[PDB]
Point group: C5
Chain length 320, copies 5
């Protein structure tokens, strides 16, 4: 009934072993206290008892000089990534460029590379969708926008905000580690595991410098991702403003047409009032006259036209 961790252990030779271990047993094996493996923070990287404990959203990892541990890897679609890349990356000719460096360098490089790839994939999924939605929405020949595309844009904007928050947290953690040389020195766990051995093992190679360079590379990649996401958000805001202006302009055009038609209808009704008054079933002295009917019809139509033209001219003067 005790809580357990689903642990995937990658050895220094790339061998992978998956099992389940009691939390107390894991603490005893790793020489860590219970508070060290709480993983309470959304993303964090810490060095406790010469062990690199890190969490990035759903990825919880513990790096020791002997091996790497992935915790709570189930129901996250991580099996493909783990069993297809990590044996190759840690113990092969993969994209990792820190192979001659100790195991922790390869481990942290692989973890940061996977996380940066996940963020870049999220951005590369979001960008075309947002771009095409904005292009459809800011189309100047549409009187009104599509509301389903508006909802899609809202969902994509929420996803982009979440991605920006994730990238900002990544950058903040990496920069906080890079700022202090003490954290960089602590990150070299293999160096501090046997300081006497590494006093002569390091033949002029600085582990702290290599860690600083790797973290700087990943921080620069995260900064590029953040810049791209910020540009996307700015473009979204500009497109929203353009949509507002387009809708207002269409409303103004429709209102102008409606006002002109209202002027025409008002003139027609104004002279139809005279027509109806002459059409009442009341006795008058103009029934005997013959040209009176045609004269009234002609003056009604001509006056309606003239009043409509005068009202249009007045509208043009008012709108300058």
């Amino acid at each position: 009934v005790a809580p357990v961790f689903t642990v995937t252990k990658f050895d220094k030779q790339g061998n992978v072993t998956s099992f389940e271990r009691k939390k107390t047993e894991l603490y005893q094996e790793l020489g860590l206290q219970a508070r060290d493996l709480r993983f309470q923070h959304v993303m964090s990287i810490t060095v406790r008892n010469n062990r690199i404990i890190m969490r990035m959203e759903y990825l919880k990892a513990v790096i020791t000089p002997e091996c790497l541990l992935i915790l709570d890897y189930r129901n996250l679609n991580l099996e493909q990534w783990l069993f297809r890349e990590l044996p190759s990356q840690l113990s092969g000719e993969g994209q990792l460029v820190t192979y001659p460096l100790p195991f922790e360098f390869r481990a942290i490089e692989a973890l940061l590379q996977y996380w940066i790839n996940t963020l870049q994939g999220k951005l590369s999924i979001l960008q075309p969708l947002i771009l095409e939605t904005l292009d459809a929405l800011v189309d100047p020949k549409h009187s009104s926008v599509d509301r389903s595309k508006l909802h899609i844009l809202l969902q994509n904007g929420k996803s982009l905000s979440e991605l920006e928050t994730d990238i900002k947290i990544f950058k903040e953690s990496i920069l906080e580690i890079l700022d202090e040389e003490e954290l960089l020195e602590e990150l070299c766990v293999s160096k501090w595991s046997d300081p006497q051995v590494f006093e002569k093992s390091s033949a002029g190679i600085d582990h702290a410098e290599e860690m600083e360079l790797l973290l700087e590379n990943y921080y620069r990649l995260a900064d590029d991702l953040s810049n791209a996401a910020r540009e996307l958000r700015v473009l979204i805001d500009d497109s929203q403003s353009i949509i507002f202006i387009n809708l207002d302009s269409h409303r103004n055009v429709m209102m102008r047409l409606n006002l002109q038609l209202t002027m025409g209808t008002f003139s027609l009704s104004l002279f139809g009032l005279m027509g109806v008054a002459f059409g009442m079933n009341l006795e008058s002295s103009l029934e005997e006259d013959h040209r009176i009917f045609w004269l009234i019809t002609g003056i009604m139509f001509m006056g309606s036209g003239l009043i409509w033209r005068r009202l249009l001219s007045f509208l043009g003067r008012q709108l300058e």
Copy 2:
């Protein structure tokens, strides 16, 4: 008539005693001046005369190596929290992970844990309400939004702004304490109470390091809370923009329909003017003709239809 403090004292063994003490008596017992216990700031943490005086909104606490004091705990619903958790947390197997550390560590951990739990509970109450209100409001099939839900959203946004201010103050205080090592050293009140004893009592354990780790943990939790609240505010702003665009699009659609109907009415009235003119009670030469009535009716209807179609085509050309 002198002002008094309602003091709840938790001993190192977890015993709880509630009473009322004169302010001067409290100053004499704690070895503190009057200005130290003013609690004038909304949130503050200070170390005065080897005592940790802190306030977080309605929670005022004084931590000494011997015991903990809660001041002005009445009419705040704090009795349940106090008498149900603190005896267990300070002197039991609770969630506190600093039990082997001196009493002040457990005290500050419990206080910070309670405050972070209160903030997290406020956020977890606000988030579903705001989410459901926005989902109802940004529904694309609604011609107009619900104004009662708008008022609810406004109240929830005010509450969220207050929560963000509280989280920001928490983060600022914790970060200000963490920045200077002097404050961290001062926080270890038991260490400085008897420096001669603790010169040998601390068998290789660094109290300052433990305090730094605890404060870093709580600062990271507060940072996560602040990130979540900022994401909620950004989502609120995006939903407001989407609501604006939806309302404008609905207005444009309704205006287009009204303009088309106005065109139809204008054409109908234009030919009804001819109908009325022919319907006047004035003598003419066309009463004798038989087909004239049907011809006039037919040309009126056909011309009304043709003018309506031409006006619709003109509107389509104007709106592109």
Copy 3:
């Protein structure tokens, strides 16, 4: 004709004396150059020739170990504050908590307390007015807002922006003083007036520490005021957005009702066109028939109703 200062001098014993002194005479008495008393900055605090020269908007003060000087105190409603509080605060049992400390501590504490009280009073005047104006404006049952209340809100927002600027300047000055220990040491003017005497006069009491604590207290109070003002501005912006959404929703509802009525009027006019055509004074073959009139009337009314219903259904389909 030479410029003069209206000087109110408060002695160390609380005695108050008001007079007018030539600027050159004041410079000679205070041992300060002309540039020191320019008071060109809206708010500043400086230590020149062992004298604390400060200005906060309309309050210009010079603090020396012997006494305090208030300059240009006329036509500012400051007489009540001066002659009712300062004799009591500097030489009595007032709210000042630095009485055993040298005179400059009491002086600067009284000045900062008065300024923070003025800012807090401005905020406590602005807050209820803004709150009630927003509550009236964001009322969901109002079709349109009250424009006089809008102007009142604009004036209150301008006042709140000015208050925020004042609080920000206060915080910036206090934080700039607190950042450098040299400024804090300079602030202890009585300590540096006779360093030989104060080498033994200070029996274990640190004047710099007391000054730092006092400035920290006032900075925290100013930070609380700034947080409250920022919350007020954020609430104002949110209320403005809610007002915009409410007005747009009311416009949409009115437009929908107008469109439905336009559909009804259009159908009525469409069948009134047939009515008028049958009502023309032209010969036809349907006058002999008896049921034709009732048939035409019935079909006109029924078709008007049916076309209105069909148009309403079309509008419902269009608006989804």
Copy 4:
């Protein structure tokens, strides 16, 4: 054909001499390289080869212990300022407060004073215009705003943004100089011209301290100007929001009136349909009856009134 500088030289005694000098000759005389006098930056202050080279927009100056040089002073309306103030300020009883200090102090004080006066004059020109334009625009009794005043406000806002950029650059340059003591020491060009002489010439007076105080004074003045400009921009934004709300409220009121009139017209047309149907030239059985005409007229008018009242009540219910 070689490029030349129009140089105005002010001697230590205030004598002014205007001439034109070849760029190479100026470099040889001042002991400076070509890159030093490029003046490529909008505003900069630098110390090269014991010479203070500064540019502030159109004002290019080179300060040496012997004299001051103004370059490219033509076609800028600077002749009045130069020949009316600088001889008086550098060698008289002007507003300069650094007369006993070496010549470079007076020179830099005069230059910074002129630039701060120019910025303050720009702000004092912009502020009344913007204030009166906003007051005219936010008038609650105007149905629509004046568009010419809108264009004036746009131009003034662009000018205010340019002024804010200039003030920000001024503040940034002054603060960057003040941050590093090395730059402040370099600014004392007369001190470093003959260090052996000034080792004993400076009888207890610190040139670096005086330079720091002068730069702090001008930085505080620039900060006050920036605060005023930021307040003006915030007021402009608030006035724009108030204008938006006023226009929306006026639109809503007009729409409500139009909707009520549309209800009235719809009821009138609904009963005029019955009137027209009874007015058709078709045989019926109601011509014989005498009271039928008055009954129809009365029911038409009464029903029109009742339907209008019912529609108004329905609108009131809908708008709550």
Copy 5:
């Protein structure tokens, strides 16, 4: 099949040679590892193994004391710039002002000058287009804006945002290099190539100081560019707000005219209802009277006019 670099090598004497080299061969020749030439960052400047590796968007360069290398220069329109300026700039009398300095100074100066010229050209292309588009759009005499110009403005705003991001990255990289003296010292690659030779070769000239001055110059140029771009964005936002206000004012004016015409039409229809009622084909007692027809017509017209005037007065009262 191995990846290759298209390398353009500029010798210290200005000779240019273009070829293609295997990546491994380039690493061997430059003494650099594979990770050094990844060019994964949008812009970066680094010093690896005494070589300055930099990338600025599409421009990838490697600076060694012997020569300069441009990588991946094809299909970028860079041939003109390379073969027309760089031989002249590096080995001639060009705009470079660091000719007596070692080769790396000239190389980095030329690269930074080209990049700053590219950014300035982009800004100088964007600014007139944006200015003219805004001037056309904010024209107060236009009832509605041009939507094609709106799309052009949106595209130009996206381009301006990209330019701002590029300038910000440039400034960040230059400032990060300038902040640390270690990076500035590393940048002097020729100095560290043969430290023994340059211990006496540098006859009182500080390479680090020259590098700092050059980087400061380019940072100031980039800051000016960023200020101009920010001013352009602020002007764009202000113009958008002015366009919104203009469209709202035009809508309000059109709505007022439509409401007045609706009042007129409503009065005309109200009295036409009486006209139609009197015009019904129903028997009455007023056919015998002679003046009744003219009386009805006169009262209808007069009442229509009076009701229209009263409605206009009511509208004026409502709108204040």
